[PDB]
Amino acid sequence: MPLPKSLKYGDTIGIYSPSSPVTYTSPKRFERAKSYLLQKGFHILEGSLTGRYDYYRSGSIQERAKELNALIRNPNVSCIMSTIGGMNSNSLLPYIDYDAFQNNPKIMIGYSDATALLLGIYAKTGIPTFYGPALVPSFGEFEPFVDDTYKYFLETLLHDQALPYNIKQPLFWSDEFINWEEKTKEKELRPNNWISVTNGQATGRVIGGNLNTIQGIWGSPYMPCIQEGDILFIEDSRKDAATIERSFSFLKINGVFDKVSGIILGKHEQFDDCGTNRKPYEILLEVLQNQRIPLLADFDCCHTHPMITMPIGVQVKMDATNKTIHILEKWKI
Amino acid sequence: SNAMPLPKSLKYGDTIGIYSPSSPVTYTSPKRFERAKSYLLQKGFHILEGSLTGRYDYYRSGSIQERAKELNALIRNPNVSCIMSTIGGMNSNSLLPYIDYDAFQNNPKIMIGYSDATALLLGIYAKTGIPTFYGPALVPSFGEFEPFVDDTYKYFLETLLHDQALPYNIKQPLFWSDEFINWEEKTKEKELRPNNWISVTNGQATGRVIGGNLNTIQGIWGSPYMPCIQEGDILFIEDSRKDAATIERSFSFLKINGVFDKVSGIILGKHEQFDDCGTNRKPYEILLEVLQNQRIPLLADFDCCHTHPMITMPIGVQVKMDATNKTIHILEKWKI
Ligand SMILES: Nc1ncnc2c1ncn2[C@@H]1O[C@H](COP(=O)(O)O)[C@@H](O)[C@H]1O
Ligand SMILES: Nc1ncnc2c1ncn2[C@@H]1O[C@H](COP(=O)(O)O)[C@@H](O)[C@H]1O
């Protein structure tokens, strides 16, 4: 299993916009995010669609594929990071140069709609990819939370790590919908807990990402096949109960819960419970119908702040009862 | 092909069973519900109300198990000739593991509805091989005020009741509307908009029609409940009240699954209240960008979707589409 080199200070991070044109619509947060990473000691190479606008997207299918492929093919770029998600990353998949990526593995990181690319590249090349910060939402965040996200980013991509690698829970989180371009108040600190929904333990390859986005690639050559023993990692954001029930049942009818040994469920940013007062894991519990699968919920690798950086495609032990997550397998050189 | 099991044609005086696999419309829109019921009763049909009728569980009619129980009671009832959803929603795919496919296979009925009910229409077809129907749901379709309800009814009768010599020509409606108004109570006449279908890409295709609401298909794809698309199939798709970003994602989902390498033609419904995100693009223009250099005959703005009036389309039978001349003919029996 071929691995990317670790990030180093002085490296260049290439950025691209596979879907929403955030570098046009949110210039202040974009500039703040660039400045944050420049100050830490990284260089930013702006992809060819930076600053461009095509309404709901940055550009045509062909132009977005060209933007990403230029970064993949550039030997001076060690990390490729989405600016933000959207809906439209899956349009790029037939056009990506997977051979160039496989010949010179790099860190590929982002979240939400970029799940289509993270999973497509892993499915095509076998190289682990990373569910973690996207430049504008993640590194344009104001203090305090941006500094916690950054610590997790260094831990996974830069620091030497000995195995197993314990992924530690943050003390505080927020999903507050505020302080996007300009800071008004402090976000409330929410004390953190992971939730032992269904006790138990599971060990196996972690596969997943943004669940809504997975339904845009399922069945294709870009979705890695779920195998007996895998651990399912899933998150969604700003949906309602009706939407996530449909997504949970989509997994159920596909036999996913017959295969996986365990489930890790992210927090759900600004969940709309439709008046039911049910939490997302409770809707998942209904769909599971008392099948006993260890389930650990409110994991901080999702749309809430701060964000953990998780390797996808490597062995993990999750312990739902004790609320721990360990990476058992090397993800980088 | 060889003769196959088919549901019996609808007859005057038959009983239509109704069920709510997702949104609790019989609770939330009682005026339109009672009007739709009264419309079908006036034609001489009977209405058998499913067990969740008038019930409320927020976004849904009831629990996964309650909803399956409701539908199964209709499937198992020998006196019901047609099983019709009250409305869609998001949550019909939850029911799929629990449906008694054996009972449906033992006593086939006309299964009809649209939107989210696509999960069940395709699931039953996939499990049993019995054609199902993309067509009226009780509340939106038959609760519609005149004039449009009368056109929807004419197509429903022509397809499900009247005997039809094959090939069966599906006529273009003369008028349509997507106006979001007159739901519970009528405040104005809807505009009668002159209607056309659109020849997007010229050509002809003949094959088995498969499809439905495309957004709902992404909730069953890959499962035993989604019929496998075969070489030569005609893909029929519609969506409603989405934006350009959502439909580009759905069209690219079909592309990366190799669907456009298999199908011989595509029929695209009108898109009720489409949000173009400021692009001024039509849904078929976004689909054509996804198709890139691949030429496929394509007929768009077909009236089997969320706009009024609504055509009833059998699914799982051979069809001939002519995109150049804008015609659709059904080539194989769907009822006996
Ligand atoms: N106007 C805004 N105000 C607050 N948060 C925003 C705004 N626009 C985008 N976001 C955040 O950016 C994230 C990006 O989401 P995604 O589109 O899934 O990549 C959202 O989930 C929100 O947390
Ligand atoms: N309040 C309303 N006003 C007008 N039309 C509605 C209203 N609620 C539902 N509808 C119609 O009912 C349809 C239900 O679609 P679905 O949820 O997809 O089965 C919508 O797409 C609209 O055409």
XYZ file of C-alpha atoms and ligand atoms in Angstrom:
715
model
C 0.000 0.000 0.000
C 1.862 3.068 -1.347
C 2.049 6.123 0.879
C 2.435 9.920 0.522
C 5.403 11.744 2.058
C 4.756 13.679 5.267
C 4.179 17.421 4.996
C 7.138 19.687 5.907
C 7.397 23.379 6.760
C 8.258 25.234 3.565
C 6.152 22.826 1.431
C 3.576 24.104 -1.048
C -0.140 23.332 -0.598
C -2.042 23.458 -3.897
C -5.661 24.551 -3.623
C -8.483 23.886 -6.065
C -12.306 24.483 -6.158
C -14.046 21.359 -7.440
C -17.486 22.739 -6.641
C -18.691 26.001 -4.942
C -16.779 29.146 -6.028
C -15.938 30.149 -2.439
C -12.802 32.138 -3.387
C -15.109 34.522 -5.252
C -18.033 34.611 -2.819
C -16.152 34.656 0.507
C -12.943 36.622 -0.200
C -12.343 37.716 3.369
C -12.404 34.210 4.826
C -10.309 32.981 1.906
C -7.619 35.624 2.499
C -7.625 34.900 6.220
C -7.181 31.154 5.629
C -4.254 31.702 3.238
C -2.596 34.099 5.662
C -3.015 31.631 8.547
C -1.145 28.871 6.725
C 1.494 31.255 5.272
C 2.248 32.380 8.818
C 2.650 28.761 9.918
C 5.285 28.350 7.219
C 3.501 26.799 4.202
C 3.237 28.223 0.656
C -0.085 28.234 -1.201
C -0.330 27.602 -4.920
C -3.736 28.916 -6.113
C -5.319 26.627 -8.716
C -6.456 28.015 -12.058
C -10.110 28.605 -11.053
C -9.287 30.736 -8.009
C -11.373 33.896 -8.067
C -13.568 32.593 -10.924
C -17.373 32.427 -10.773
C -19.908 30.243 -12.531
C -22.875 30.689 -10.239
C -23.211 27.465 -8.257
C -19.769 26.242 -9.322
C -16.242 27.514 -10.077
C -16.359 26.503 -13.781
C -17.161 23.862 -16.392
C -16.540 20.169 -15.788
C -13.483 20.211 -18.074
C -11.989 23.371 -16.452
C -12.384 21.941 -12.932
C -10.728 18.678 -13.961
C -7.874 20.705 -15.560
C -7.443 22.741 -12.367
C -7.029 19.653 -10.221
C -4.874 17.751 -12.705
C -2.393 20.655 -12.905
C -1.800 20.267 -9.152
C -1.584 16.469 -9.325
C 1.045 16.761 -12.082
C 3.107 19.449 -10.313
C 6.119 17.942 -8.518
C 6.518 21.081 -6.358
C 3.120 20.493 -4.637
C 3.183 18.132 -1.637
C -0.452 18.508 -0.475
C -3.624 19.129 -2.497
C -6.505 20.680 -0.549
C -10.071 21.620 -1.601
C -11.131 25.223 -0.933
C -14.660 24.013 0.061
C -17.291 21.458 -0.975
C -20.595 21.887 -2.677
C -22.337 19.285 -4.778
C -20.338 18.809 -7.912
C -16.992 17.118 -7.307
C -18.226 13.799 -8.696
C -18.440 15.402 -12.171
C -14.592 15.445 -12.310
C -14.048 11.735 -11.708
C -13.829 10.428 -15.327
C -11.210 13.114 -16.110
C -8.691 12.887 -13.281
C -5.155 11.731 -13.946
C -5.016 8.821 -11.515
C -1.812 7.495 -13.076
C 0.001 10.774 -12.379
C -1.182 10.611 -8.773
C -0.121 6.980 -8.372
C 3.333 7.668 -9.875
C 3.957 10.475 -7.351
C 1.691 10.077 -4.333
C 0.804 13.328 -2.535
C -1.417 14.179 0.448
C -5.013 14.675 -0.768
C -7.209 16.316 1.875
C -10.634 17.948 2.245
C -14.145 17.019 3.318
C -17.865 17.116 2.476
C -18.393 17.008 -1.364
C -14.634 16.372 -1.824
C -15.401 12.882 -0.500
C -16.120 12.013 -4.129
C -12.435 12.755 -4.995
C -10.944 11.383 -1.773
C -12.681 8.054 -2.284
C -12.190 8.021 -6.089
C -8.446 8.503 -5.781
C -8.236 5.813 -3.035
C -10.361 3.413 -5.124
C -8.272 3.951 -8.261
C -4.770 4.059 -6.714
C -4.913 2.320 -3.306
C -3.178 5.405 -1.752
C -4.727 6.619 1.511
C -6.425 9.971 1.366
C -7.466 12.293 4.192
C -10.845 13.409 5.506
C -9.930 16.754 7.062
C -9.648 20.502 6.553
C -10.733 22.366 3.430
C -9.016 25.687 3.186
C -11.796 28.212 3.558
C -14.134 26.698 6.140
C -11.409 25.017 8.164
C -8.511 27.469 8.183
C -10.543 30.663 7.732
C -12.279 29.905 11.057
C -11.511 32.477 13.790
C -9.799 31.585 17.063
C -10.185 29.529 19.226
C -11.253 26.602 17.067
C -8.922 27.112 14.111
C -5.910 26.512 16.316
C -7.358 23.131 17.474
C -8.079 22.111 13.865
C -4.501 23.067 12.978
C -3.048 20.970 15.817
C -4.884 17.877 14.498
C -3.710 18.718 10.934
C -0.037 18.734 12.067
C -0.525 15.586 14.119
C -1.732 13.530 11.175
C 0.285 15.049 8.296
C 3.561 16.420 9.665
C 4.520 14.922 13.038
C 6.331 11.581 13.284
C 3.793 9.157 14.771
C 4.398 5.812 16.409
C 1.567 3.247 16.197
C -0.969 2.827 17.455
C -2.029 6.462 17.005
C -4.742 7.517 19.447
C -7.141 10.059 18.025
C -7.991 12.294 20.945
C -11.332 13.988 21.552
C -11.322 17.856 21.682
C -12.382 19.549 24.935
C -14.889 21.868 23.232
C -16.757 22.165 19.906
C -19.178 24.403 18.048
C -21.612 24.160 15.148
C -22.744 27.757 15.526
C -23.710 29.439 12.248
C -21.901 32.740 12.727
C -18.571 34.531 12.109
C -18.191 33.501 8.474
C -16.619 36.589 6.792
C -16.520 38.813 9.901
C -16.373 38.027 13.634
C -19.277 39.320 15.697
C -19.169 37.414 19.005
C -17.338 34.425 20.472
C -18.898 31.088 19.610
C -20.175 29.266 22.675
C -17.838 26.525 23.878
C -19.798 23.253 23.917
C -18.348 20.649 26.292
C -17.497 17.519 24.322
C -18.493 13.872 24.566
C -18.263 10.966 22.211
C -21.336 8.737 22.571
C -21.262 5.017 23.213
C -24.424 4.208 21.357
C -23.883 0.499 21.036
C -21.111 -1.026 23.067
C -18.398 -3.128 21.572
C -15.232 -3.207 19.563
C -14.281 -3.489 15.936
C -11.056 -3.653 14.010
C -10.673 -3.170 10.244
C -10.100 -0.826 7.323
C -11.877 2.506 7.727
C -13.914 3.641 4.690
C -16.305 6.549 4.417
C -16.718 10.287 4.413
C -19.716 12.518 3.749
C -22.666 10.129 3.393
C -24.818 12.363 1.167
C -21.853 12.632 -1.191
C -21.260 8.851 -1.218
C -24.757 8.470 -2.796
C -23.431 10.445 -5.765
C -20.629 7.891 -6.411
C -22.055 4.586 -5.179
C -21.818 1.650 -7.575
C -19.193 3.330 -9.741
C -15.487 2.458 -10.195
C -14.718 5.470 -7.936
C -16.424 4.010 -4.830
C -14.179 1.484 -3.052
C -16.062 -1.769 -2.466
C -17.104 -2.171 1.175
C -15.596 -5.445 2.478
C -16.444 -7.814 5.300
C -14.876 -6.378 8.471
C -14.489 -2.742 7.349
C -15.299 0.073 9.743
C -17.875 2.537 8.349
C -17.162 6.236 8.978
C -19.957 8.634 8.052
C -21.017 12.226 8.577
C -23.566 14.673 7.197
C -24.341 18.329 7.743
C -27.265 20.730 7.606
C -29.786 18.014 6.640
C -33.108 17.030 8.189
C -34.388 13.787 9.691
C -36.111 12.804 6.451
C -32.891 13.108 4.478
C -30.692 11.114 6.872
C -33.294 8.327 7.293
C -33.192 7.933 3.495
C -29.359 7.816 3.626
C -29.274 5.295 6.486
C -31.809 3.054 4.733
C -29.771 3.324 1.488
C -26.851 1.729 3.406
C -29.183 -0.903 5.011
C -30.719 -2.098 1.717
C -27.264 -2.248 0.150
C -26.176 -4.771 2.764
C -23.561 -2.465 4.279
C -24.558 -3.293 7.865
C -24.240 -7.006 7.101
C -20.576 -6.396 6.189
C -19.045 -3.747 8.473
C -17.731 -4.596 11.937
C -18.398 -1.115 13.383
C -19.774 2.396 12.672
C -18.268 5.808 13.532
C -20.783 8.672 13.182
C -19.753 12.320 13.017
C -21.582 15.176 14.670
C -24.287 16.648 12.449
C -23.880 20.423 11.992
C -27.173 22.312 12.495
C -29.306 19.123 12.287
C -33.038 19.728 11.636
C -34.913 17.054 13.604
C -38.280 18.024 12.047
C -39.844 18.419 15.479
C -39.150 14.820 16.524
C -36.499 15.550 19.153
C -34.623 12.513 17.820
C -30.854 12.563 17.380
C -29.278 11.271 14.194
C -27.926 8.115 15.907
C -31.456 7.341 17.081
C -32.690 7.377 13.497
C -29.771 5.100 12.583
C -30.759 2.782 15.509
C -34.299 2.465 14.070
C -32.917 1.522 10.649
C -30.537 -1.037 12.220
C -33.488 -2.786 13.935
C -31.451 -4.082 16.884
C -28.621 -5.558 14.827
C -25.749 -5.292 17.249
C -23.070 -3.324 15.562
C -20.730 -1.290 17.739
C -21.583 2.395 17.186
C -19.643 5.445 18.381
C -21.292 8.775 17.683
C -20.570 12.515 17.677
C -17.033 11.966 16.321
C -15.321 15.299 15.582
C -14.402 14.649 11.980
C -17.199 16.480 10.247
C -18.627 19.958 9.657
C -18.411 21.035 13.343
C -15.368 22.925 14.710
C -12.738 21.844 15.447
C -11.921 19.140 12.923
C -9.758 16.039 13.219
C -7.791 14.849 10.155
C -8.541 11.129 9.543
C -6.719 8.857 7.115
C -9.127 6.832 4.984
C -8.264 3.318 3.809
C -6.145 2.118 6.755
C -6.692 -0.289 9.689
C -8.367 1.186 12.790
C -9.625 -0.227 16.161
C -12.682 1.568 17.437
C -13.978 0.901 20.914
C -17.517 2.250 21.271
C -17.870 1.293 24.973
C -14.687 3.104 26.033
C -15.002 5.742 23.329
C -11.581 5.346 21.751
C -10.262 5.330 18.170
C -6.763 4.066 17.308
C -5.036 3.991 13.904
C -3.196 0.668 13.722
C -1.498 1.095 10.310
C 1.017 3.693 8.864
C -0.634 6.291 6.543
C 2.406 8.289 5.358
C 6.201 8.165 5.005
C -40.739 -11.810 -25.202
C -42.701 -14.655 -23.591
C -46.028 -13.725 -22.000
C -45.458 -12.836 -18.331
C -47.532 -12.326 -15.166
C -49.336 -8.992 -15.400
C -51.755 -7.253 -13.129
C -55.412 -7.337 -14.090
C -56.738 -4.164 -15.746
C -58.570 -1.708 -13.557
C -62.398 -1.931 -13.883
C -65.100 0.536 -12.943
C -66.189 -0.281 -9.418
C -62.773 -1.615 -8.374
C -61.246 -0.765 -5.018
C -58.136 1.469 -4.888
C -56.054 0.998 -1.763
C -54.121 4.055 -0.551
C -51.084 4.152 1.750
C -48.561 6.806 2.991
C -45.041 5.451 2.721
C -43.452 8.802 3.583
C -45.003 12.256 4.193
C -48.190 12.335 6.359
C -50.197 14.225 3.736
C -53.603 12.881 4.858
C -53.012 14.670 8.163
C -51.358 17.842 6.856
C -53.516 18.514 3.794
C -56.961 17.165 4.705
C -58.854 19.385 2.240
C -56.945 18.185 -0.832
C -57.020 14.620 0.505
C -60.858 14.640 0.818
C -61.251 16.307 -2.571
C -59.022 13.664 -4.251
C -60.968 10.907 -2.567
C -64.250 12.401 -3.657
C -62.974 12.747 -7.264
C -62.303 8.979 -7.604
C -65.491 8.023 -5.754
C -67.522 10.105 -8.259
C -66.112 7.999 -11.104
C -67.424 4.923 -9.343
C -64.236 3.602 -7.686
C -64.025 2.572 -4.028
C -61.256 3.888 -1.745
C -59.748 1.673 0.957
C -57.825 3.818 3.428
C -54.540 2.374 4.644
C -53.968 1.997 8.399
C -51.778 5.131 8.704
C -54.404 7.382 7.109
C -54.884 10.548 9.146
C -51.867 9.692 11.328
C -48.880 11.965 12.038
C -45.229 11.427 12.944
C -43.665 14.733 11.994
C -41.791 14.173 8.727
C -43.399 10.756 8.201
C -46.718 8.896 8.593
C -45.268 6.448 11.116
C -42.331 4.200 12.015
C -40.552 2.045 9.429
C -42.447 -0.975 10.747
C -45.854 0.797 10.841
C -45.407 1.958 7.236
C -44.437 -1.529 6.019
C -47.427 -3.006 7.852
C -49.737 -0.481 6.173
C -48.570 -1.319 2.663
C -48.409 -5.086 3.273
C -52.062 -5.081 4.453
C -53.038 -3.744 0.996
C -50.717 -6.135 -0.835
C -52.280 -9.089 1.055
C -55.896 -7.939 0.513
C -57.481 -9.865 -2.377
C -60.182 -7.189 -2.819
C -57.793 -4.377 -3.716
C -57.135 -3.955 -7.491
C -54.804 -0.970 -7.360
C -52.401 0.297 -4.696
C -51.710 4.028 -4.923
C -49.399 6.180 -2.764
C -50.997 9.286 -1.189
C -47.903 11.344 -1.772
C -44.105 11.018 -1.732
C -41.543 12.443 0.592
C -38.145 10.961 1.288
C -38.649 7.760 3.172
C -40.210 5.015 1.061
C -36.775 3.135 0.681
C -36.951 2.299 4.430
C -39.786 -0.131 3.692
C -37.985 -2.251 1.094
C -36.583 -5.032 3.358
C -40.022 -5.568 4.936
C -42.438 -5.707 1.975
C -44.150 -9.007 1.306
C -42.958 -9.527 -2.254
C -44.254 -13.078 -2.114
C -47.811 -11.911 -1.445
C -47.551 -9.355 -4.292
C -46.261 -12.072 -6.574
C -49.147 -14.338 -5.416
C -51.768 -11.700 -6.230
C -50.397 -8.929 -8.539
C -52.057 -5.558 -8.432
C -51.566 -2.269 -10.294
C -48.963 -0.459 -8.174
C -48.906 3.277 -8.994
C -47.490 6.562 -7.753
C -44.523 8.832 -8.284
C -41.615 10.754 -6.767
C -40.318 9.011 -3.593
C -42.656 6.055 -4.311
C -40.166 5.238 -7.118
C -38.259 3.237 -4.450
C -41.262 0.913 -4.139
C -42.238 0.903 -7.847
C -38.722 -0.154 -8.830
C -38.278 -2.442 -5.794
C -41.409 -4.412 -6.614
C -40.449 -4.609 -10.286
C -36.927 -5.745 -9.360
C -38.142 -8.456 -6.987
C -41.201 -9.724 -8.842
C -40.704 -8.811 -12.512
C -44.232 -7.334 -12.533
C -44.491 -3.948 -14.352
C -45.354 -1.011 -12.103
C -46.614 2.449 -12.990
C -45.144 5.909 -12.724
C -48.311 7.950 -12.437
C -50.827 9.652 -10.135
C -50.471 9.768 -6.378
C -53.836 10.383 -4.717
C -53.376 13.795 -3.103
C -51.244 15.840 -5.541
C -52.658 14.222 -8.698
C -56.368 13.673 -7.996
C -56.700 16.541 -5.483
C -55.774 18.965 -8.267
C -58.652 21.349 -9.113
C -60.201 21.327 -12.554
C -59.216 21.573 -15.431
C -55.960 19.690 -15.056
C -57.267 16.804 -12.912
C -59.570 15.774 -15.798
C -56.590 15.352 -18.158
C -54.631 13.347 -15.556
C -57.718 11.156 -15.118
C -58.150 10.611 -18.856
C -54.541 9.303 -19.128
C -54.989 7.145 -16.014
C -58.150 5.552 -17.488
C -56.649 5.138 -20.925
C -53.607 3.355 -19.592
C -55.069 1.292 -16.735
C -58.708 0.588 -17.657
C -59.342 0.888 -21.389
C -58.202 -1.927 -23.661
C -55.313 -0.689 -25.850
C -54.116 -2.056 -29.214
C -50.313 -2.075 -29.456
C -48.317 0.061 -30.226
C -50.050 2.437 -27.804
C -49.376 6.086 -28.625
C -48.890 8.379 -25.597
C -50.484 11.695 -26.622
C -48.910 15.045 -25.761
C -51.125 17.070 -23.394
C -52.223 20.398 -24.872
C -51.653 22.513 -21.711
C -49.573 22.347 -18.517
C -48.627 24.199 -15.336
C -46.110 24.039 -12.504
C -47.635 26.937 -10.485
C -47.254 26.484 -6.741
C -50.755 27.498 -5.733
C -54.252 26.117 -5.193
C -53.030 23.400 -2.871
C -55.759 23.250 -0.159
C -58.012 26.037 -1.461
C -58.374 27.642 -4.903
C -57.439 31.324 -5.098
C -57.079 31.799 -8.896
C -57.117 29.832 -12.159
C -53.742 28.288 -13.008
C -52.354 29.574 -16.294
C -53.017 27.082 -19.104
C -49.575 27.104 -20.699
C -49.359 25.799 -24.278
C -47.398 22.564 -24.161
C -44.612 20.992 -26.170
C -42.105 18.274 -25.793
C -38.485 19.090 -26.732
C -36.371 17.276 -29.258
C -33.030 17.823 -27.536
C -30.996 15.332 -29.576
C -32.500 13.687 -32.682
C -32.925 9.982 -33.210
C -34.952 6.943 -32.175
C -34.610 4.235 -29.578
C -36.530 1.062 -28.767
C -36.022 -0.785 -25.495
C -37.267 -1.563 -21.996
C -38.116 1.636 -20.106
C -36.557 1.930 -16.609
C -36.502 4.917 -14.303
C -38.558 7.265 -12.251
C -37.612 10.046 -9.906
C -33.856 10.370 -10.249
C -33.181 11.818 -6.804
C -35.016 8.826 -5.246
C -33.052 6.374 -7.360
C -29.839 7.460 -5.522
C -31.442 6.075 -2.343
C -31.847 2.539 -3.818
C -28.932 2.259 -6.247
C -26.745 -0.828 -5.995
C -29.327 -2.736 -3.892
C -31.432 -5.792 -4.754
C -34.337 -3.360 -5.132
C -32.846 -1.457 -8.080
C -33.346 -3.253 -11.365
C -30.070 -3.590 -13.250
C -29.893 -1.281 -16.279
C -29.255 -3.373 -19.382
C -27.768 -2.587 -22.783
C -30.477 -0.989 -24.949
C -32.746 0.226 -22.097
C -34.497 3.578 -22.394
C -33.795 5.705 -19.286
C -36.794 7.744 -18.058
C -35.937 10.326 -15.411
C -37.597 13.307 -13.675
C -36.886 15.574 -10.728
C -38.753 18.429 -9.079
C -37.971 21.537 -6.989
C -34.185 21.025 -7.120
C -31.379 23.350 -8.164
C -28.776 23.156 -10.911
C -26.101 21.896 -8.487
C -28.278 19.002 -7.286
C -29.142 17.830 -10.787
C -25.598 18.088 -12.081
C -24.621 15.749 -9.223
C -27.382 13.291 -10.181
C -26.515 13.381 -13.887
C -22.805 12.808 -13.133
C -23.836 9.937 -10.773
C -25.442 8.232 -13.829
C -22.418 8.997 -16.024
C -19.820 7.521 -13.656
C -21.981 4.413 -13.233
C -21.771 3.744 -16.969
C -25.536 4.250 -17.427
C -25.078 6.395 -20.542
C -22.908 3.712 -22.118
C -25.852 1.255 -21.850
C -28.989 3.220 -22.670
C -30.271 3.714 -26.202
C -32.275 6.807 -25.405
C -33.372 9.150 -22.602
C -36.794 10.618 -21.746
C -36.530 13.577 -19.318
C -39.591 14.947 -17.543
C -40.359 18.605 -16.949
C -38.768 19.908 -13.761
C -41.346 21.567 -11.507
C -40.112 24.976 -10.214
C -36.486 24.362 -11.207
C -33.931 26.671 -9.545
C -31.277 27.490 -12.173
C -29.016 29.240 -9.615
C -28.826 32.311 -11.858
C -27.362 30.385 -14.833
C -30.559 30.534 -16.986
C -29.736 26.956 -18.010
C -32.406 24.330 -18.573
C -32.039 20.893 -16.962
C -31.382 19.231 -20.335
C -28.486 21.666 -21.028
C -26.797 20.553 -17.781
C -27.358 16.917 -18.725
C -25.838 17.537 -22.166
C -22.668 19.009 -20.537
C -22.353 15.830 -18.506
C -22.798 13.724 -21.704
C -19.854 15.591 -23.268
C -19.129 14.084 -26.711
C -21.574 11.166 -26.429
C -24.625 11.502 -28.647
C -27.852 9.948 -27.276
C -31.409 10.536 -28.568
C -33.165 12.639 -25.945
C -36.786 13.806 -25.617
C -37.340 16.357 -22.813
C -40.156 18.116 -20.984
C -42.150 14.853 -20.980
C -45.344 15.161 -18.929
C -44.774 12.307 -16.518
C -43.429 14.202 -13.566
C -44.486 16.687 -10.894
C -46.097 19.154 -13.350
C -49.858 19.055 -14.195
C -51.302 17.102 -15.914
C -49.685 13.765 -15.413
C -49.354 10.862 -17.789
C -49.375 7.277 -16.467
C -46.285 5.373 -17.700
C -45.777 1.611 -17.375
C -42.217 0.754 -16.253
C -40.387 -2.436 -17.276
C -41.933 -2.839 -20.752
C -40.630 -2.153 -24.283
C -41.122 1.382 -25.579
C -40.235 3.208 -28.784
C -39.128 6.820 -28.330
C -38.717 9.061 -31.336
C -36.900 12.172 -30.266
C -36.859 13.689 -33.741
C -40.673 13.558 -34.121
C -41.423 13.739 -30.382
C -43.420 10.531 -29.977
C -43.573 7.762 -27.373
C -45.269 4.391 -28.002
C -45.691 1.477 -25.567
C -44.926 -1.808 -27.431
C -45.766 -4.636 -24.966
C -48.823 -5.419 -22.802
C -48.754 -4.092 -19.260
C -52.066 -5.445 -17.901
C -54.514 -8.247 -18.661
N -22.658 32.132 5.165
C -22.152 31.154 5.947
N -22.210 31.262 7.285
C -21.745 30.334 8.128
N -21.166 29.209 7.676
C -21.010 28.994 6.348
C -21.513 29.948 5.377
N -21.224 29.442 4.168
C -20.614 28.238 4.330
N -20.519 27.975 5.641
C -19.859 26.839 6.303
O -19.035 26.195 5.374
C -19.288 24.796 5.392
C -18.942 24.246 4.024
O -19.776 23.200 3.718
P -19.614 22.299 2.410
O -20.414 23.141 1.448
O -20.334 21.033 2.751
O -18.160 22.182 2.007
C -20.766 24.738 5.793
O -21.187 23.467 6.241
C -20.830 25.808 6.864
O -20.272 25.315 8.079
N -48.060 23.614 -0.037
C -48.058 23.222 -1.337
N -48.429 24.034 -2.351
C -48.429 23.651 -3.641
N -48.029 22.418 -4.007
C -47.610 21.538 -3.086
C -47.620 21.864 -1.679
N -47.171 20.790 -1.015
C -46.910 19.825 -1.931
N -47.159 20.295 -3.159
C -47.088 19.544 -4.426
O -47.036 18.180 -4.118
C -45.842 17.600 -4.661
C -45.373 16.521 -3.750
O -44.234 15.915 -4.276
P -43.557 14.723 -3.536
O -43.174 15.154 -2.140
O -42.315 14.655 -4.404
O -44.410 13.481 -3.703
C -44.903 18.789 -4.794
O -43.829 18.554 -5.681
C -45.845 19.874 -5.257
O -46.166 19.676 -6.631
